[PDB]
Design a protein around this ligand. Structure first.
Ligand SMILES: Nc1ncnc2c1ncn2[C@@H]1O[C@H](COP(=O)(O)OP(=O)(O)O)[C@@H](O)[C@H]1O
Ligand SMILES: [Mg+2]
Length: 737
């Protein structure tokens, strides 16, 4: 039947290597059996488009001009890939609209420009309205979640997704503002202020500049915002995920360490900071490696003022704040300690070194002991102790490991205190969860950190697909309702390759058991186990030190060096002991106790989170990066199309197009709509009673369908039944009155 639409003047989409899809118009009517189409391109040139001799499949028809730039993609006549790309291009380039709906899921595009599209009057304008009675915006999602939590008394979750830089961090912040405003009616409104204040604090400690993002979010965050019976904020709790430790000691060619170090170095001249004995960021190796200590459009000194102000608002006094700056200053002074070689396998550090002097002074430690333990290691046996001198390379490695460890304890200490400030005495009626996770990334060189983040992103896709596609269509099959299968790309195989008993993480952990274990040996074990036995896993022709894996977004090559070390993540017992013995109270609090590998800990942490998400009603936001140049309102078609297919956008709209998301059991429907039924319509069979009543209430049979155990409805029909229920109760009250 679709071939009847291929008439003279009809428009179609044809594949193009650079533009992905090109629009063309038919110069003649198509007849079944024709091998070439005479097309007029929009550039003024005529083309003979040859059809496939085996399949005879025609190019995609283009939707009418009235359907260009629609608020909801389900309004399109032809629901195919070229149509999606065109509709989003027009709304972005022409209309400057960043938002579009794909049913319940929201699509967000990064503008690379500040626009005033979120005044409190806008917040008020989105408040109190229906879905679609406002145009697409993040506030609509927030309001829908607010509306659902209040009516359903069910916890909700806001899940944002996308590759690095797509606007995801930005989206979560604005959603929180909406809830804080509505809740703002409270007496102890300071709690909402504290909740919003949490974000900039974590950004200072948690973010750093990458080539992808000037403010990359190098840890994960999940926030539960609790509500009372009044549907007003009671408090909150943050659960966070693995921070990039390698960032403290290393930075690439145009990257920085965490923002807070630069804020502290910018404030070195102030009298309060004088005790720290700091200089500019160029003086310390841990800050200098990147080659550029400043971010354009950012004033580190100004940010330092804001960060301090944020700390005081949470109730963190100046003594606490000066205490954290001391730790950070100490990490910088440790980074420039001079270490000299003795013979081939020994090292020595002088008790005279200027940087180690202030390090020992700030930490409240003995210089002579630190010189000894940076140069030697202890081996303890039941009967005796043995000492091994360390090489120059080992001394610097030992020093750096301690720096990562200190920074890690410090980050955790801060989040614990914000959670203490965010705590609530009252009982939780319900909650809204917000997820903010580092997005898919790739570089010239990729390591263990990229492996972990990509693996986490794979899990998010699995949760999304399980809920949206898998769980949902399986129900229709069991329900015995006419259903056409909707295809999706299932990533379960790569997930098994990573997580299963035979998986990559398990093999790395087994290599960690062996003292003889090596990255080379592990890579060889991966090749032996999977080189030609697996389709998701492959090795490049030129290398034996790296491997490539097929993720949902793209294939990624990972270098094997450092994987066992990074999986172990440990520090010498003597160094931790000298810090446990420190004179400064904060250091002993971290070093006091306030076997599984980082990879094992990471898997379970993600499992607990997946389980947590499954308990709530999800609300998904898909963020897209339009261009790599960071330019205002520029659209890259090749780059966009790959993100759309990776996100499964088209199939999400096709499943949405099938409709019937709402589903009442015959018992629930009967119990809720008994008032719309006359006593004569109530048969011994509840199922037949519901059929007879629904057939009387709704005349169009295309708006509802009957399954084995549930009744299915099209959009707006339950609201119509609620209007009828409300009208019947009102009429009954008037009759009684
Ligand atoms: N509302 C916005 N207005 C302007 N630029 C934005 C907006 N949202 C995101 N961006 C741009 O996208 C970049 C990355 O988005 P952000 O949410 O900050 O981090 P990410 O998207 O990586 O989570 C920002 O640095 C900024 O350049
Ligand atoms: Mg981010």
């Amino acid at each position: 039947a679709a071939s009847e639409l291929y008439t003279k003047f009809a428009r179609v989409w044809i594949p193009d290597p650079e533009e992905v899809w090109k629009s063309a118009e038919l110069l003649k009517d198509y007849k079944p059996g024709d091998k070439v189409l005479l097309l007029h391109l929009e550039e003024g040139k005529d083309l003979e488009y040859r059809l496939d001799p085996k399949t005879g499949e025609l190019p995609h028809l283009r939707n009418p001009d009235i359907l260009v730039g629609e608020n909801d993609l389900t309004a399109l006549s032809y629901l195919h890939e070229p149509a999606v790309l065109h509709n989003l291009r027009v709304r972005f380039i022409d209309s400057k609209l960043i938002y579009t709906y794909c049913g319940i899921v929201l699509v967000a595009i990064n503008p690379y420009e500040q626009l005033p599209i979120y005044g409190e009057d806008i917040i008020n304008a989105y408040s109190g309205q229906n879905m679609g009675d406002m145009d697409p915006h993040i506030f609509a999602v927030a309001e829908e979640a607010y509306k659902q939590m209040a009516r359903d008394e069910r916890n909700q979750s806001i899940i944002v997704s996308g590759e690095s830089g797509a606007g995801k961090t930005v989206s979560a912040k604005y959603a929180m503002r909406y809830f804080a405003t509505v809740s703002g009616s409270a007496s102890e409104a300071n709690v909402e202020e504290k909740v919003l204040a949490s974000n900039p604090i974590m950004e200072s400690i948690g973010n750093a500049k990458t080539t992808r993002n000037d403010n990359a979010s190098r840890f994960g965050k999940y926030i539960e915002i609790g509500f009372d019976k009044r549907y007003r904020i009671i408090g909150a709790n943050m659960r966070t995920y693995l921070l990039e430790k390698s960032r403290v000691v290393f930075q690439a060619e145009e990257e920085r360490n965490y923002h807070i170090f630069y804020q502290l170095c910018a404030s070195a001249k102030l009298p309060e900071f004088k005790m720290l004995r700091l200089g500019n960021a160029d003086s310390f190796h841990y800050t200098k490696q990147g080659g550029s200590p400043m971010i354009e459009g950012v004033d580190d000194a100004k940010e330092m003022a804001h960060t301090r102000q944020a700390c005081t608002l949470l109730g963190i006094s100046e003594s606490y704040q000066m205490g954290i700056f001391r730790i950070l200053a100490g990490i910088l002074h440790l980074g420039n300690v001079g270490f000299a070689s003795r013979d081939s396998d020994s090292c020595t550090i002088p008790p005279k070194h200027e940087p180690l002097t202030i390090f020992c002074d700030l930490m409240g430690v003995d210089y002579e002991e630190m010189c000894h333990w940076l140069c030697h290691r202890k081996l303890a046996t039941a009967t005796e102790t043995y000492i091994k001198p360390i090489s120059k390379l080992q001394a610097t490695n030992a020093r750096d490991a301690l720096a990562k460890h200190i920074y890690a304890k410090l980050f955790n200490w801060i989040v614990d205190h914000v959670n203490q400030a965010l705590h609530s005495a009252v009982k939780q009626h319900s909650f809204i969860g917000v997820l903010d996770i580092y997005g898919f990334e790739t570089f010239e060189i990729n390591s263990f950190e990229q492996f972990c983040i990509n693996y986490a992103n794979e899990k998010l896709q699995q949760q999304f697909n399980m809920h949206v596609f898998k769980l949902e269509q399986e129900e229709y099959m069991k329900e015995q309702i006419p259903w056409t299968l909707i295809d999706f790309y299932d990533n379960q195989p790569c997930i098994n390759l990573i997580e299963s008993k035979l998986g990559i993480l398990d093999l790395l952990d087994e290599e960690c058991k062996m003292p003889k274990g090596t990255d080379d040996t592990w890579a060889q074990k991966l090749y032996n186990t999977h080189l030609n036995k697996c389709a998701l896993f492959e090795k490049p022709r030129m290398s034996n030190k790296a491997f490539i894996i097929k993720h949902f977004a793209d294939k990624v090559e990972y270098q094997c060096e450092g994987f066992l070390e990074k999986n172990k993540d440990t520090v010498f017992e003597e160094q931790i002991k000298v810090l446990k013995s420190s004179k400064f109270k904060m250091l002993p609090e971290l070093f006091q106790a306030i076997k599984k590998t980082v990879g094992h800990q990471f898997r379970n942490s993600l499992h607990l989170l997946m389980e947590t998400l499954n308990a709530t009603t999800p609300h998904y936001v898909r963020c897209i990066k339009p261009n790599d140049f960071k330019f205002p309102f520029t659209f890259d078609e090749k780059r966009a199309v790959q993100q759309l297919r990776a996100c499964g956008v088209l199939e999400t709209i096709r499943i949405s197009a099938a409709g019937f998301p709402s589903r009442w059991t015959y018992q629930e429907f009967f119990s809720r709509y008994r008032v719309l039924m006359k006593q004569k319509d109530v048969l011994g069979d509840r199922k037949q009673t519901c059929k007879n009543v629904l057939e009387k209430l709704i005349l169009d049979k295309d708006k509802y369908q009957f399954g084995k155990t549930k009744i299915f409805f099209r959009a707006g029909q339950v609201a119509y039944l609620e209007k009828l229920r409300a009208d019947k109760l009102r009429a009954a009250c008037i009759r009684i009155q």
